Amino acid sequence: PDSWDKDVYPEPPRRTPAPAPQTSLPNPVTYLTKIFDLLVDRPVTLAREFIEQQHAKNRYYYYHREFRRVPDITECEEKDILCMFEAEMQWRRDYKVDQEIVNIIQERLKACQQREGESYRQNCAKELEQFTQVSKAFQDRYSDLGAHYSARKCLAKQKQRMLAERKAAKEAAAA
Amino acid sequence: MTMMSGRPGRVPLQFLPNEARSLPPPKLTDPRLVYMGFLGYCSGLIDNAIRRRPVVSAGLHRQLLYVTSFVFFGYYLLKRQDYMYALRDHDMFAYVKSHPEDFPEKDKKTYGEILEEFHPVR
Numbered sequence: 001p002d003s004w005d006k007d008v009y010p011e012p013p014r015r016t017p018a019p020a021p022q023t024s025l026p027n028p029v030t031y032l033t034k035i036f037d038l039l040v041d042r043p044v045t046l047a048r049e050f051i052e053q054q055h056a057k058n059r060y061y062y063y064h065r066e067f068r069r070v071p072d073i074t075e076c077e078e079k080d081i082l083c084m085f086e087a088e089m090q091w092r093r094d095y096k097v098d099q100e101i102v103n104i105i106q107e108r109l110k111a112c113q114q115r116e117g118e119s120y121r122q123n124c125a126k127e128l129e130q131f132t133q134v135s136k137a138f139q140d141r142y143s144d145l146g147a148h149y150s151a152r153k154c155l156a157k158q159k160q161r162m163l164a165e166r167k168a169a170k171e172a173a174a175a
Numbered sequence: 176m177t178m179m180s181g182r183p184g185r186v187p188l189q190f191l192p193n194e195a196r197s198l199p200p201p202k203l204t205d206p207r208l209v210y211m212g213f214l215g216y217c218s219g220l221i222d223n224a225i226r227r228r229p230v231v232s233a234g235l236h237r238q239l240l241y242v243t244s245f246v247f248f249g250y251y252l253l254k255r256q257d258y259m260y261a262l263r264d265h266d267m268f269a270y271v272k273s274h275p276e277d278f279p280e281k282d283k284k285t286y287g288e289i290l291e292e293f294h295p296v297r
């Protein structure tokens with residue numbers, strides 16, 4: 001339904017075939033599902049309708065909290081405690097958001113694997129590629145920081161990787 | 176070593192120089208004063224216990240005198256301690272001001288220009 005964004009959690013157009021009876025015998029599944037409908041789905045629907053009627057008479061709202069951007073750890077002086085504190089809080093929030101991004105991608109992958117059935121090895125290639133890219137980026141950002149991680153250690157890791165990449169590029173240039 | 180014995184202008188046995196009158200006195204609800212009164216009350220209770228008297232009820236005048244004496248001494252003790260710490264800060268700041276060569280303020284560097292080694296945890 002409309003509870004979630006359908007672009008963040010996409011699904012295929014859901015093609016399902018029409019019944020094609022070939023036997024004169026009746027279908028026990030159809031009879032049982034008609035009984036289930038009439039005996040289960042209607043009272044539950046009525047209870048939900050009553051509950052939603054009660055809810056509509058009391059409509060109140062909650063809001064998503066907004067955070068502005070503060071200077072990063074790169075723009076902080078060495079011993080400036082306040083700027084470091086704000087930058088560290090911002091970095092921790094970004095870390096949580098990145099974890100949730102990875103979680104969304106993994107949810108997509110799992111759903112595709114279940115959905116595609118016997119053809120999952122070929123029909124889930126795109127989700128697997130997206131997970132591979134996101135996992136590589138996340139591993140580059142946050143892996144091996146250890147317990148007691150911080151923004152400063154992440155910055156040191158990025159600087160080390162940048163130095164290695166610059167050296168490799170200059171050595172390949174001399175080839 | 177003695178830091179403050181030979182500090183110029185120090186009166187030998189004063190316990191409270193006139194300069195200390197320029198500092199804010201401790202409040203009468205200072206938690207340190209409350210703890211000193213608590214020490215006096217404990218002294219009164221122990222006095223009752225040692226003398227084989229009912230600990231909480233035996234002498235109310237004696238307990239009151241205990242608490243009052245402890246608070247009275249603690250007030251002046253706190254005043255002198257605050258004065259000594261103020262003197263230490265004053266001398267430290269004056270010395271830093273009079274010897275700028277020994278206390279330079281070097282140029283500030285941001286963390287985007289400081290190379291820190293990264294030690295992976297694995």
Ligand SMILES: CCCCCCCCCCCCCCCCCC(=O)OC[C@H](COP(=O)([O-])OCC(O)COP(=O)([O-])OC[C@@H](COC(=O)CCCCCCCCCCCCCCCCC)OC(=O)CCCCCCCCCCCCCCCCC)OC(=O)CCCCCCCCCCCCCCCCC
Binds near residue numbers: 217220228229230
């Ligand atoms: C950290 C946070 C703050 C904590 C502060 C520090 C701890 C508390 C303060 C310490 C000093 C306070 C008490 C000193 C005098 C006590 C001496 C004593 O004998 O007590 C008996 C006495 C009872 O005697 P009694 O009523 O006359 O009749 C019974 C007979 O006397 C029967 O007596 P008896 O002689 O025949 O019985 C024999 C008994 C008699 O032996 C004793 O009673 C032992 C007492 C030794 C006193 C403590 C030593 C000096 C203080 C140092 C404490 C160090 C603390 C740091 C941690 C390390 C722990 C050691 O000996 C034994 O049975 C042998 C037992 C072996 C065990 C050994 C362990 C002893 C050391 C443990 C000390 C723990 C702290 C104090 C515990 C409470 C004691 C009452 O106890 C009391 O009733 C007095 C205590 C309560 C009064 C205070 C209440 C205030 C008013 C109420 C309202 C509150 C106002 C709040 C404001 C808000 C408004 C609503």
Ligand SMILES: CCCCCCCCCCCCCCCCC[C@@H](O)O[C@H](CO[C@H](O)CCCCCCCCCCCCCCC)COP(=O)(O)OCC[N+](C)(C)C
Binds near residue numbers: 180188
């Ligand atoms: C285990 C608890 C320790 C308690 C010790 C006994 C406490 C009760 C004794 C009360 C002291 C009476 C003194 C008040 C009368 C005025 C005297 C005054 O003129 O003396 C001054 C001196 O002031 C005293 O020294 C201050 C006494 C206060 C001591 C308390 C400090 C204890 C350490 C913290 C523990 C908590 C204590 C709790 C109190 C109940 C002069 O200074 P000065 O002549 O130039 O010093 C000579 C020595 N020098 C130069 C080498 C330094």
